[model samples]
Target chain A: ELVMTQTPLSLPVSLGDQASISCRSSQSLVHSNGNTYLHWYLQKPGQSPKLLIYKVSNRFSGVPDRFSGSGSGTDFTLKISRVEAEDLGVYFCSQSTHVPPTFGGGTKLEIKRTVAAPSVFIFPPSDEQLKSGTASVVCLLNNFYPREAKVQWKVDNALQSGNSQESVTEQDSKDSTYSLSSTLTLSKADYEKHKVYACEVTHQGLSSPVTKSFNRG
Target chain B: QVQLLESGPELKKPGETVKISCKASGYTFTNYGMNWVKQAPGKGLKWMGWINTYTGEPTYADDFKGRFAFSLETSASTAYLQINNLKNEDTATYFCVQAERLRRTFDYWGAGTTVTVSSASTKGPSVFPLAPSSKSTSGGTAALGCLVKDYFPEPVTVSWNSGALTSGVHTFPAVLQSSGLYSLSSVVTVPSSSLGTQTYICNVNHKPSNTKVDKKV
Candidate 1:
């Protein structure tokens, strides 16, 4: 192996799952001075690389305890106790013990289902507008993960499908989370009869579903 | 709304014990960790360390080793930074910054408390390493960069000038070096066609001498 090169071009780990990357140097990382200067760095997309583990197992300042560096000599490992949403990046191992420092080939960290729970916002039609014709309830789901969340509507706990809405999830300019919305048209009679209209969200992470009820009041 | 405030002794003597306090309010203090930073009279930002508000674990950096310690009073919603056996060189302002929960970054600042340790050996800064480098691009424009490193006493603001216009150049903030000195860089971009035949100048305007370094591109 080249001096300090990581394996597995890309590691796909799920949230809350264990992750370990291996780095092997061609020669011993130990120096005659009886010290090891092997270090680990995490490089986020388009941002400068940040030190994670410096000089073997000791972490850089402000680094989370979940990130740990271990091993010695030609073999070393960087382990993450539980991969987080922000851990998606490339990891590299470099050695300073060897006069001229060298870096290992970086390993990309791929996060599967890197999405958060959807935040729901309901905009019920105005009372005066509901007085004349059908009422349109706008349901907005903001900052959801997987980009494949389905927004289901129900009137008084009964399924109301076939609502017209956008097909693609609108990418958020900031934070990269996906947002989507749906509009449910209800008749004036239905609004008066049904005391509660509900919006249900189904995602990959949630155990069952997230339901938010909007009262006609 | 949440607030973070730092409290410390404004006047201190050499070789005295010192402890600075950070009191947090409006939110669950244990929900987020606390960070300590240092800033000399004219130096760059320095990270001391952090304390785990929930777990009571403390982590420190290189400079904060030995005498520096981080502690917390979870019940009181307060964190502590204690420096033992202080010296005249320890005369600097200490700050408390709040970590973005779970993310390895500091996003919130605290109005720092200024502490002055009595010192008499206040010497002027030593400036050297005026590295001026330049290159030409394929599009036929010349980009120039001047870096001034290792200057004692910070706020080493510098400016750049070229054949085009002095006002067009951009100067960035000065950074503190490890040797307790200030470092700064400035850049200017001009037409590639006018490359090599133009005169470039870097003026250390903030320095006492107002020294100017010139290079022929």
Candidate 2:
């Protein structure tokens, strides 16, 4: 089976700037007949995908010359020059050189904006939760721009294990932002033994990791 | 976009060595892992191994642990699979795959390269003559083809009737197949009016074994 991989799951670009999205195929897109079967498409907001480039580099009818496809064999690229407002959407690359054609992970292109660091907060287990033989501590990271952020939990400065991080992020409707949380559970015995717990967040907006620690009374 | 193209229909003699390459492009060379998979003629797929491009570490499947290695030419963005002391059982198509380490997903694949390990058991050509197509060309000529497959030792000759075909004849080069044998085809165009009752003969000569194979339609 062929697989098509794409980079920059999400991209932030300014208007009128050139943007490039990469699509990689596990196999050469060049078919036996010597023509590369790679193509590019733009799935604009609320619209179906529209073909922009075909056969590696040929522009489809009515497609602007600003959109181009380049590269050969397994590596192919789709570039959009002077990005317009209508260009803010998902871009995908596809290959049909072998059996069972495949498409790359779509790259979302959005308007560029100023990003912010996440505000880290830690919530210690409540008394009611500790009475149940297990204590759960929640680490919340909020109001972060550019959803690319990660959260880690630690106990007394050491990395914690057996912690579950939210698989999905919460996006802020007003400002194109994101937030997520991680939950660490402790047995009653470990809760009594451990005195300090910390939540750490790493994000592009932050110069360094931000940590919030909670101490047991 | 990322692209991978596997190298060659390698013709190797048993006890000899062979190296296949998976050339990659459209992405950073060391950003992802590369994997190799094998599929024998009429057999299911098998995992050969994987290589960590960034760390230069290789991991192999049990069957591939010996006499097989994965290496890389980082600057060229190419990964290599070297097999030593090739065996006839090694006749198969090898595919180079690009994988996402964290997701455990294959994202890209190289158009597979077939490797043929010729041994003492290699056989002579199987000859077949195809009837001229019913469709007539602009010159009212029909096209016929001679297929010679599964032959070994390279040097082989094809003719129409008893002598050389000077015009309207096209012969292709011998192509190595996964069966450790070669295949070739020759086509000739003849007057469509002759289709009703004319006899066409294809002659193939395999010199190493002193064999003359003929087909008529």
Candidate 3:
């Protein structure tokens, strides 16, 4: 089975804008039988997937002229000259030239609009951690649009390093927003002296970065 | 408007041969490609490969290489599948799928032909719950769909939100597949504002085994 890779898991597109997606095969998609079996399909919400382009660049029957496919060997591109409301969905590329057919992970095409900033919240160390003489403070960044955010930790408003750890970012399908948490560990003695631990979130959606601080209780 | 109908069930002894035909109508048969799909009584859909209707060229999946052949009768607008040395496991429903020219996208499917190799087959259905999305209509509605596949005994009940809203739900009749099993699709529409704030559930009840599957989105 040849591995197929697709780019831009989430693509934000405005109506009338051209959208392009890339799909690359692990190996040449050309079969020994002289046929290149790469094909593209679009799956709309609540609908089955339909083929849009086939082989390499041929449009499927009834497919719009705005949709075009190109590339050969291993690299391919699917382009929609003018993205339309009806084009919002997940686009997938598949290959059957190899013995076992495989498909790309898929790229979601969504309406592009104003970005939303994340709501920052900081959590105090747990009682068990405080009893253990080590504090593990958590900083959560929730409900952010565009899936990208930078987090930094500070002690007494000064930048801190070698203590903060990042966690996996997750997306909420309902609103297409993201959430993640970062953890900072310190000795109870350090927490007592520092007095305040702060987390800063930097995102494009924010006109100014936001900070949330946790103080010793 | 395209329609495909395959031959009826056949009872063949082990080591014997069986040939099935798929007749096409409502379109020019030679203008499109044709594919063969196999589904064992309790298994998933397997692509047996496709044939080029215009040139009489055929491609087979790895497992169907030696014992299977795909041929077309241009005058009769029919495609044929011949399998030699049938085994007990060969008892499956075979479908003649029609693809659009070079697109290779399956657009029309035959009802399927059941082949019993002097042997057996069911079981229960598998449920696929999907995420909800805003309906395309101007109204503020959310849409979701649930798929039930490969179930035997036909009778299945589908509900939304634990059977609360029936007016916005449409459950299609379970369609028997070439595998001798059945598949169904049910869709529900609700207010888009009701999404995310509350859990919307898809409930499936396979009446024969009294089995129920539930998932929320």
Candidate 4:
């Protein structure tokens, strides 16, 4: 049986800081065939562990490049270059080439939220093209929450009335978070040059509405 | 969605045998193989082996060589691992993993069966006469003891005879001491008429293996 040991069962790190975890094996995990059996996993609180790296240092499918694993023989390391807000979780290392595969104790990466920043979101319009008789402009909110937010359209710094617009919200499959999108349509006369079109998304959590403007030719 | 379920009892008697099964659903059984893993109580994982559901071929780890056997019922989409001569050290949760393809890694795992070895009724037979002794007697009694180390809390039985004794198969429970080892003893009294320079045989059956013995008395 291979005795796998991990140091410092847990560690605390501030946001934007780097963290590393070590994994050691009693015997060499490198196979004669030139393939190392070391692997790493991340287990967030209350969620199943996800494979971070396999065969020593190769990232799994869909995994970001920021997470990296390295080392050989009995010693290995998993390094996280930048700690993202979503990266707070526990990490583990495992080996599969031996008779009885084993895993290391997990290390938790805690995020310390010292400062809060306002969330910014952008949304793109639908795939359909705008009608020739009417002019349509797309407004995007990359990341927003609390669907009660308001969006206003303005023409030449003046409020526009009787404009048709639609808003929709969708959730991300990986994180189950929500995002919003909107589309605005106006008459062909409004498509003239220098005609200003602005979209404002106002939410209660923010001090003021976040706005972006564009021109229709 | 494909689902796999593993079901079995949590307790087993030492020296007794146990078989666990893994059933798969929503997918073709012939397309994937089932992997088996062992996890000590509240500890990390260990890979025992894997069974090809389509080909019925089983490969075991070095530590599981003689005691573990993997089987499958392709028609029912179920795979099984049978462990013989169980010991307390064998107590652990076993899981079955379903691979996406023939050579692919496991993508789905069954819940697991937690089997704990307890006291059992049978003990392995004891072998005697480590060295030849000058003591001679007719129709006298003889004591034979078998020394087993490292295996604990498992039943061991000792049987003695000229060839294979079917009638007087002696069985006893192994005694465990503070050092975490097991030893079993058995006494055989032979009549002088039947003991004229005869060779006595002893056989042992345990989780690790089934052994035989021969001694000149």
| Candidate 2 runs further than 4 Å off | A1-10, A42-52, A57-67, A84-86, A131-134, A145-150, A167-174, B1-217
Q: Which one wins by lDDT: 2 or 3?
A: 3
Sort the predicted structures by DockQ, highest score first: 4, 3, 1, 2
Which pairs in model 1 have colliding backbones?
A4-A104, A115-A145, B140-B192, B141-B192, B196-B217
**True lDDT of residue A66, candidate 2:** 87
**What TM-score does each of the candidates earn?**
0.30, 0.43, 0.43, 0.43
User: What would you estimate as the lDDT of candidate 2?
Assistant: 0.71
**What stretches of model 1 exceed 4 Å from their correct place?**
A1-217, B5-23, B26-80, B86-150, B161-203, B207-217
Q: Tens digit of lDDT per residue, candidate 1, span B1-217?
A: 3477778446566788888888898366766667777767544345676788879998886667898989888778888888888886787778786754433344455667777665332223332221121221344434454544345444455555534355334444544433344544444546655555655666554444444444332
lDDT of 3 by residue, A1-217 (tens): 6888897787988789999999999999987778788988786643445678888798878999999999979999999999997898888888877765566878989767557797665666655446767565666665677768988898888898877655533333455566555667677888877777889999888888888776673
Give the per-residue lDDT of model 4 (tens digit) for B35-97: 787877545566787877767888887777899999988778778889999988898878787
lDDT of 2 by residue, A1-217 (tens): 6888888787788789999999888877777778888877676532334557777888867888889889988998888899987777788787657664456768888777688887665556655446767565656555577778877887877887655434333243356566554556567788888778888888998999888776782
Candidate 4 yields a Cα-based lDDT of 0.59
Query: CAPRI verdict on model 3?
Result: incorrect
Cα TM-score of candidate 3? 0.43
Model 1 Cα lDDT, one tens digit per residue, A145-216: 666787888887889876534323323334445655565666688677887788887876567888866675
Better of 1 and 4 by DockQ: 4
- What's the TM-score of chain A alone for every prediction? 0.52, 0.74, 0.64, 0.50
Error of 2 at A102 (Å): 2.5
Report the lDDT of model 3 for residue A65. Answer: 96
Q: Cα deviation in Å at residue A38, candidate 2?
A: 1.0
